[PDB]
């Protein structure tokens, strides 16, 4: 649910390199 | 006091300078001198006496200053703050279970982060606060972006420069932004009124 989207969201923002 | 002249100390956290001025002299002089001598722009500084901003035309007499009183030179920050952070004193126990640990693959290879999603209660825009599990480094960039909704790129650049010059950041090749150790993160948290959130992030399971 929201947890998975949060996980995907966070990975995306972390790798904003 | 009855003295005609006064010694005043101005501190910006990094450097301290003593000044002797007549108590009838506008503090404009002292503020401009501190900025000049430190190689800083006046617009990047705010000068406070006992928590109150000093106006340029005010004199030590006006303010009833005493010998060896201290003037604090605070850096400028964006004018508006995330209303999530309107109370720096709240206990952080309920925020810890909101944190999440996550493994992220890089080319060499995995690294574990802890994150805390923080939602602006007015705009509903969220930001993540980010911690590296290995050394407990905190992304100061993530803190600043969460703290100041309307920050300009210039303001962000100024702040990241200040962090480099005054605190002890690292660069990780793998992840962008400025990452700082726990003590530095908590110093910034006080500046940004984010203490309960950074406390929670630092204590959370990895």
Residue numbers in the entry:
A (entry chain C): 2 to 18
B (entry chain A): 7 to 212
Authors' account:
Bqt4 is one of the most abundant INM proteins in fission yeast Schizosaccharomyces pombe, and plays crucial roles in chromosome-NE association by interacting with different protein partners. Here, we report the crystal structures of the N-terminal domain of Bqt4 in complexes with Bqt4-binding motifs from Rap1, Lem2, and Sad1. The Bqt4NTD comprises six α helices and six β strands arranged in a compact α/β fold. Overall, our data suggest that Bqt4NTD is a protein-interaction module that recognizes a consensus motif.
Moreover, Bqt4 interacts with another INM Lem2, and this interaction mobilizes Lem2 molecules around the NE to promote pericentric heterochromatin maintenance. The data showed that Bqt4NTD interacted with a short fragment of Lem2 (residues 261–279), referred to as Lem2BBM. ITC assays confirmed that Lem2BBM could interact with Bqt4NTD with a Kd around 0.53 μM. To understand how Bqt4NTD recognizes Lem2BBM, we determined the crystal structure of the Bqt4NTD-Lem2BBM. Surprisingly, the complex structure of Bqt4NTD-Lem2BBM exhibits remarkable similarity with Bqt4NTD–Rap1BBM. Lem2BBM adopts the same helical configuration as Rap1BBM, and interacts with Bqt4 through the corresponding surface contacts as seen in the Bqt4NTD–Rap1BBM complex. All the hydrophobic contacts and electrostatic interactions are conserved in both complexes. For example, Lem2F269 is sandwiched by Bqt4F46 and Bqt4F61, in the same fashion as Rap1F503. Bqt4R48 coordinates two salt bridges with Lem2D265 and Lem2D266. Mutations of Bqt4F46A, Bqt4F61A, and Bqt4R48A decreased the interaction with Lem2BBM to different degrees, indicating that the observed interface in the crystal structure is essential for the interaction between Bqt4NTD and Lem2BBM.
